[PDB]
Task: structure prediction
Amino acid sequence: KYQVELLEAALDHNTIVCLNTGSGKTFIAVLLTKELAHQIRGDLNPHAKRTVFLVNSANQVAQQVSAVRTHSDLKVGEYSDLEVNASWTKERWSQEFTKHQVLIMTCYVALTVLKNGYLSLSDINLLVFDECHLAILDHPYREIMKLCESCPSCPRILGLTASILNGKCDPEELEEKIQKLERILRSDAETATDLVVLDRYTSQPCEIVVDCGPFTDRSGLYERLLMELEAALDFINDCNVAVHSKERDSTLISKQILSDCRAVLVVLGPWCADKVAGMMVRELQKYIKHEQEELHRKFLLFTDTLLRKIHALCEEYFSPASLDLKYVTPKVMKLLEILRKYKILCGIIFVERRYTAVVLNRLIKEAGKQDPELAYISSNFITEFRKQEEVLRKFRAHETNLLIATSVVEEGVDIPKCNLVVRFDLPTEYRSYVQSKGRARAPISNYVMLADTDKIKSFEEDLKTYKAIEKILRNKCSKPPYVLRPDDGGPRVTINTAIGHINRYCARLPSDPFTHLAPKCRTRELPDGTFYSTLYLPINSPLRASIVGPPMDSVRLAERVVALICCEKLHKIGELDEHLMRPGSTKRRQCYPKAIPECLRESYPKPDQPCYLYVIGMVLTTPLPDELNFRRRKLYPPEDTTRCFGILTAKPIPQIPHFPVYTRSGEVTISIELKKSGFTLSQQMLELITRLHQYIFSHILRLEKPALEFKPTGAESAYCVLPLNVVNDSGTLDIDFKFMEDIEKSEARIGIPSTKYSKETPFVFKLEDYQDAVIIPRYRNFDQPHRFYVADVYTDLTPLSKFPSPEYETFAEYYKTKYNLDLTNLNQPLLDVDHTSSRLNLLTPRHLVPELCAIHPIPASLWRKAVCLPSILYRLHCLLTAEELRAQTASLGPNPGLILQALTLSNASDGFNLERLEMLGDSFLKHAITTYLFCTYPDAHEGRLSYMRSKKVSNCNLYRLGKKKGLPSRMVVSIFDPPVNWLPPGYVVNQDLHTEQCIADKSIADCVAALLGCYLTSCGERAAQLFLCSLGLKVLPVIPDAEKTLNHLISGFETFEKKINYRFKNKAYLLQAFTHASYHYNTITDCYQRLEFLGDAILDYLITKHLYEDPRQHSPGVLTDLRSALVNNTIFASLAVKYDYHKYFKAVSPELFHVIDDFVKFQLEKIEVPKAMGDIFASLAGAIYMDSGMSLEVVWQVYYPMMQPLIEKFSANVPRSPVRELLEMEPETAKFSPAERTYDGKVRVTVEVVGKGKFKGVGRSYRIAKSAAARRALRSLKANQ
RNA sequence: UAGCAGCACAUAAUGGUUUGUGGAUGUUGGGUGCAGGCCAUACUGUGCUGCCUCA
Result:
């Protein structure tokens, strides 16, 4: 609160302020400059009034000038070099004054230019004095000020200083310095320090003093120790008189060690110090070796001699195992009593030296362990480059209740509220008292001091002096009842609870660690003296207007009454109530039945209904390349064959797009085209068709699984498949009745033929009969058929020819010996054969003696065309399901091909996957939901928006909607394994892997997302938005001084508007965008948090669209990696800094200010990423979209040039998440071990790549450790490549 | 172009052994991390193969 009070005080009247550190100094300076900068902008004659800075030293000039230039928008000018400045003339300073707006110069230069008068006193606006204390002394600032005050119209001077309280006899010296300073500056002074502010607002801590008396040892060993200390001093004197070199100071370590020894012995016990001394001796021996002078080395050896002498005296210690409070310093007993009194216990102890702190911690720990009563003890200590990391680790260990610390604890650490601040010794200066007492912020705050009885005499007057200084500092700073309804509704309301209610209401509002929530109240003054209070809620509140009540004299009455009437408005908003206050998880899986399209259901042909016939046109569009071909059997284009299959059905089949299949010839396109229609069949003919269909199916494919049994009727899939041939030589295909009936009467219909070949009736071979032939060997595998295609006839090869193996000379010998088979004809040819395809999943690309054989009835050309029949029929079922879904949802529709892409899960391993559509649909879903919420509920804050958005887009909600609309029932998940899972038509299981599929809810949600991606990529944005309404997700509609204050407050954003290359028709949205929560002066508009919600969703949807439309068509892993990279907040922050948005951003949080000040120089070189930068970056995008009338394309032309240099870099070298990257490289062999906690508190994880090694990684979190382990694994694997 | 049993060698794995080395509460060294050198059990892959589907 002090920062806001100082800012508004400086705004109201000329202010003098005493600071503590340079951060606040620069901060208040630049902040007031920004606040009053509106008066400087504009090269207009009636107001050409500038701002000037006066400094004493060049180094500070450079520091401040650079800080202002970097973080300010106004151009800056410097006139520091006195000789150069003085070597100038009036007409050349003229253009210098005209050029820059902010001027910085040294004291001598300032006095020179003021003396000459060029810098008009009326042209200065904010005369800021740095190190204002110099004005007290005989400094040129006095002359400068008498000059300025001589003018009629004067600037708003400000004095900034930090050297106050440095006096000796402060109770009167400070008063005189303050009075003389203020009368010179003719202004009011305000002061603000952490402790004084905390005590002013709370005044909770209580101070306590504890007296201690000296204690000696009966053994007198203490005196022995003093005499060895004196011996050490004598040795140091001997070294001093014999240093023998002015440039050598190697004795410093020696006197430092002796100083530590005497200090620790006098203050506390020596045993801890003596024990810890050995570690320093381990380095001291190295220093001894490093020592060059033999005499000095000998002295340092005597230093070791002394240390071991004390070690020798340590033998006199009695029972070192436990001290029993018999040899410790009496202060230890006092400390133990203090600790026991409260024996929570969040205690902070202060001590002088670091070594003293270490030994004190050791002593306290040992006492706690030895004393059984000491059970609450949990102590730690505060104090190469590793030590800094250790300090950070110890900061993370802040949860310890007892912390010992040295003087460094006064700053640089956000210690929580403490209930017990122990001061082990008398503080040296009032400032130390301030910093030390400024930490006991707990309610039960006890600031306890430990002091020797003798020294209390001085400490008493010191305490008096300190409290007097605090008192003068404080003094200088000082200088009907509401009811819901008449009868019922809830509890009564009292006047005193109003402040508490307002406070908790303020606490309810959203905030981040950098912001602070607090209302502002002040009294309007009245001539009658009955000033009335006015209240202002934070900018994020739903309403922004002054709340007032009747005018009363009393402050308490006015404040409570204004709070009470405020509660009326809070309830009108609805903030007050009657009291005025797993599913969707990867684990869950369900089995669902498959569904057959309605067009295919009830398709059994019958004579009393006309029937339709479709032809399965097949064309070899893309034959396999010759180089790829290794099997080398000749290609078989099915178009040459006059025969072709077709589907006979009783109900028309809707059209479906052409689709491919992959077979021997390669990629063959299918066309299920209706060629003939409106024709019945005879009864007997119908039985012929049906029996032949069963015969062909069963025997050709051999899929008569005993679990299944045939049903001529009553099965859901009852569509017939038949062959066709050109009939009557008319070039028109038809059902070849003659061919079917001839095959039906074939003698080789069942079983192998028993040929009657003999020497009198030998076998005769006819090439034409074997031109197209499938032959079944008879002799081999009786009752176990094996079919082969005829490749070609090798007339040159005969049974009498030479056999390959040396076991037999000829094939005839092989047949006569291994099987004893007679051949009637000896001089007859042989032919080559090929094995019938054992594989049946053709849905995706994976890249003999004729006498013994028997001719199969069906020709091999038709057999080859039949091998694709199951694949084609299954794909037909899939496409028909997809088309039915598309038509139902339509009732310019989306392509069923994309629908198929959206309905197939990745587990199926199908060539058509389900990721790109998923990603696009998910992004669009988020954007649509966010836009709907923004439009439907204008009066809502970020908490409500974010919670409702996450609830609406919740995966459980998506699962519920999908199941409600029946969407999950349509996907395909199982890999196509027809031998196991396929249920062919006419066959059903006779009393699950056939009629049921198990799918996870995650996959269901992914499919629903893909559907959205499909519709967005096909039917356009409007149709995609309408799709959610079709799904039921409601996202479309059902179907006094403002101008002058805005005109002033807009300041100079025009120079930014030219950078963004765009101008809004309404100026309110710029202010909406950049209005931070802390800059409460803007009472006209809302904050930026509301614009964050819309801006993020806009930029996410735009970036996802741009990545998806990339013609490279990266894999889903790359897409996910790129999405995470582009959406990363560090990236958005870097982009904001690259385009200097921070130069125009305005905020009040000093912590945020310092963080940004560091962050900006970090990027200027080219580390905490400030969240505000990303927030403003998103909010600007939201502003562009809001003014553009819901036109995304306009936002794209604005932001694409901004993003263009980054996407090129990322696409050129995509950063791949190590986790998913490893999972993709080794989806099965990579196994991650459970989380293991190491002794240092970190988590160790082991990843095992089966067959490639185990890798261990350590990290603060399980995810980080996994990432490190994956990185190590990938690095090893690539090194091994 | 099928199935299966041995052999050479690489691998990391679960156990140990031993030389060196580390900061550490180090009551006078068993708490723990990383290099070399060995012993046992066990996994995968290319070859040396061998038998055995079909001709």
